[PDB]
Design a protein around this ligand. Structure first.
Ligand SMILES: *[C@H](N[C@@H](CCSC)C(=O)OC)c1c(COP(=O)(O)O)cnc(C)c1O
Ligand SMILES: *[C@H](N[C@@H](CCSC)C(=O)OC)c1c(COP(=O)(O)O)cnc(C)c1O
Lengths: 521, 518
């Protein structure tokens, strides 16, 4: 029944051979602004902070510059209009926040290395899986018999973002499902809870909900299931890549990164994956191959969303009196500071890489973010281009040097305490939304199927009318309540409570939901 | 330079005074550098852009999903993105509108990185298309599924990267692995049949490629492509349209004319491809595809080459005859088959928006045809649009940047932009040789005919850093480190005018490395 307002008309934007005069140009740009302004003020269905007035005022001045952070962030290079000094400051801030070792130092293998992304976290996850594929397969690093030793196998939950399926295909990294079907067809160690057959699942199971199946579960990886699957492949001699979701796309779940690491480390130690000799190439002689020592596992944290707020929630959890807030749910230790003891290898720093999107929690006018790892994992670049004056250590070639300014400006405006307040208000407002949806069910006698994983900044509920979805940019997901059976489909939407989503905005949405024709029935 | 101390981000934040001081320091640095940058292919003037588009800075714009599909993230500029894509589709003689039911119609999208993304996407798309992975759903030979990649020694480093990312095998790798003693080319330095690492570029006065024009040697390419095509391999060829260091244009028309008969001889125009078996039986399912893919890396040159070719076709109408011929390169390039049919030769093009047009961050275009589209890696509900692109979230500000640029200029204005740059590149070359004679020094100036860049001897570090001159070392005899020469180049972009070049030249004439030249 509500009005999402008119879309843009392509006729206004057609670019003729002769160009457009100033009046037609301004009319078009005004139409874009009127559209974008209406939509941004009502967007509540995606993990995208929408308020950036301060940014715009501070940084509009930089638009006349063709900024390019071409090459590694830790060398200027020949393209002098670059913001690498700013990029390093932003990377340093997140390195501290994620308990990485600073400063970056190419002679310190344990120190951080990372760079700012020109796409979103899609670039960071692609880079992670490239870096891990090469590291685990034995390609040469920047610093100097088992048939499966150079055949890595990827593991991640059913709540993992579609970017991984893409990245897996781009990079030719094999999932445990693919390798299971190919080489180990009848040896799946898990029993399917629907069919009772030992069929290889397509992703690692996520935890079950009230249904006994994952569709209504919290969206967290099932650690038991993961450990069974990892043991299976590690015992066969495969190196192991694990992606863990810190703020999953639809449910905002946090995989229990510490629990996963505690479970898997003994498996890694049992199967010789903590420290192992790796043959990297060869050359003609009496002998042949070169050799170095590497770990045989790689744990990546997809923190596209959650790496931006989780450190601040955990700060409050550590000092609840000081911040005046005890978070409702525990968020798992997930970062470069996570270190575990072993039987005979000393303490092991468990996480190899993290990705974060800057346009999610912080907010930006275009996609950006961070990939971070450690110097000891850096792969030799694919080539040595003279013409950029800095090593080609990154996924992108030319790199966005405006995004460093965006994030620097954001981070400079807020103290740690202010950042804690932002995640507090969002957590409290997500809880409020869930409370209001169940109250609506009782007031109106309607089913909304509301759900919210404890500690998540998103709430899911029954999809309303198409018009309401379009007004508020609600993101949609269908689930089959019993996998395989198309008659059990439910359509959900979700709301992401970002720092730009306040009580008034949620109350306005709720007032419209209460009068929506699909909701009423 | 900028001092990192001014930029460190404390736990407690920075106050408004420290914040403004830092941002002022950045602006002062960037402003000084941008006004003197002449060494990279990056248009530096965008005052109009800034005035028109700063207003959009408050929006978290996201063009998530396919440009031609509705999606749930409503603060998007896909209507604008499609207008930009339509403009370049026309400019590159693609078929419009995009229509998923028309195999011949264009498909493309705007890049969130630069052309690195477009070249990566091209090679991904070609790898899957040539290997037999499943195509997008509309509304014997042991080498058949092993594509081999070919490109010249002047190809940008993004290809070496993309090859490694995507696991695409170059002719050099396949040659060493499978055909170690069968290289059909003789090395001009050693006289041995050693597989070269890239397809040779054309020789210069030296007899070697270092002082050549930077264009692919079409003969050498044809010999190499025939070799692998006769073995049953499908073929990926990348052609440079405005190469990175020399600004050369591979002769795409000549390449296509040379290669088509080779493709016909070895059954690569129409090739039965097995893309798995049916869900019931192990019956190899098959459709018909071409067995070659020609990609044009027009990072730079796809932005200006159409306009120069416009003038070449009507020189009295535009008041300009370009001195150099630029090759036909685009989606309109169609050649006759042996049977007097026609074949559209080019499969894809990439362009960077931050090169010829100018942008405040990297952006660009990848374009192909609907008939080449691969089935998406998965089908996510939560964007509401197919995942058909390299990026996930996508930059929806870049469409505004390029739309604003393109809306400001007529075809005639765009012709004038490339005219002026061509004429100024020729002027710069004239001035450098005049300087050699006046000062009695060797500057090694070189300009490939039709290029917007001129190379010369590397001057002092100070001058290099002031004018952001890009540097390249060459070995004048490959493998001999004693023959190293250090060059720089100047790119004459639309924001490079005569005054700027004359100011550079005045400094070069008093430069200590130039004057101290042995
Ligand atoms: C990002 N997920 C959302 C992107 C739009 S909201 C700013 C999404 O897919 O919702 C439909 C995301 C990615 C990919 O990051 P990009 O920045 O889009 O490239 C990866 N991993 C997770 C967990 C995400 O949420
Ligand atoms: C881009 N080449 C230059 C990028 C800096 S100038 C804006 C370069 O390498 O500088 C010396 C280029 C690419 C890659 O495009 P990106 O936009 O950098 O990702 C690919 N192909 C060619 C021919 C290029 O020139």
């Amino acid at each position: 029944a509500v009005d999402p307002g008119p879309e843009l008309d392509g006729g206004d934007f057609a670019l003729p051979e002769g160009g457009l005069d100033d009046d037609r140009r301004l009319r078009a740009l005004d139409a874009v602004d009127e559209y974008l302004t209406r939509k941004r003020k009502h967007l509540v269905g995606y993990a995208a902070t929408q308020d950036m007035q301060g940014t715009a005022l501070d940084l509009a001045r930089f638009m006349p510059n063709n900024i390019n952070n071409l090459g590694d962030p830790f060398q200027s290079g020949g393209y002098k209009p670059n913001t690498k000094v700013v990029e390093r400051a932003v990377l340093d801030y997140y390195a501290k926040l994620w308990h990485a070792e600073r400063p970056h130092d190419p002679a310190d293998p344990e120190s951080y290395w990372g760079y700012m992304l020109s796409m979103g976290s899609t670039e960071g996850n692609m880079y992670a899986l490239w870096n891990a594929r090469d590291y685990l397969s034995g390609k040469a690093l920047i610093q100097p018999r088992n048939p499966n030793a150079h055949h890595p196998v990827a593991f991640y939950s059913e709540d993992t973002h579609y970017s991984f399926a893409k990245a897996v295909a781009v990079l030719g990294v094999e999932t445990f499902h693919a390798v299971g079907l190919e080489k180990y067809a009848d040896e799946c160690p898990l029993v399917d809870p629907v069919t009772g057959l030992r069929t290889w699942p397509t992703e690692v199971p996520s935890r079950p909900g009230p249904s006994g199946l994952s569709w209504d579960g919290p969206g967290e990886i099932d650690v038991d299931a993961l450990a069974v699957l990892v043991e299976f492949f590690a015992a066969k001699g495969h190196p192991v890549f694990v992606n863990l979701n810190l703020g999953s796309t639809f449910k905002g779940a946090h995989d229990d990164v510490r629990a996963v690491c505690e479970r898997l480390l003994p498996i890694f130690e049992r199967h010789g994956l903590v420290q192992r000799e790796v043959v990297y190439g060869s050359c003609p002689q009496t002998g042949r191959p070169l050799v170095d020592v590497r770990r045989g596992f790689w744990i990546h944290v997809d923190g596209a969303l959650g790496a931006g707020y989780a450190p601040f929630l955990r700060l409050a959890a550590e000092d609840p009196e000081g911040y005046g807030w005890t978070p409702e749910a525990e968020l798992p230790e997930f970062d470069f500071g996570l270190r575990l003891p072993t039987a005979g290898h000393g303490e092991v720093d468990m996480v190899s890489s993290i990705a974060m999107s800057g346009h999610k929690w912080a907010g930006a006018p275009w996609p950006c973010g961070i990939y971070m790892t450690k110097v000891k994992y850096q792969i030799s670049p694919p080539s040595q281009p003279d013409y950029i004056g800095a090593p080609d250590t990154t996924f992108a070639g030319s790199r966005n040097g405006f995004s460093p300014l965006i994030l620097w400006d954001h981070l400079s405006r807020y103290s740690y305490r202010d950042q804690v307040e932002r995640i507090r208000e969002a957590q409290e407002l997500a809880a409020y939304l869930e409370r209001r949806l169940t109250a609506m069910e009782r007031e109106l006698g309607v089913e909304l199927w509301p759900a919210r994983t404890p500690g998540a900044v998103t709430v899911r509920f029954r999809k309303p009318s198409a018009e309401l979805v379009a007004k508020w940019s609600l993101s949609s997901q269908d689930v089959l309540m019993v996998p395989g059976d198309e008659t059990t489909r439910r359509s959900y939407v979700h709301v992401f409570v970002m720092p730009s989503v306040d009580r008034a905005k949620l109350d306005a949405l709720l007032a419209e939901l209460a009068e929506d024709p699909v909701i009423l029935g």
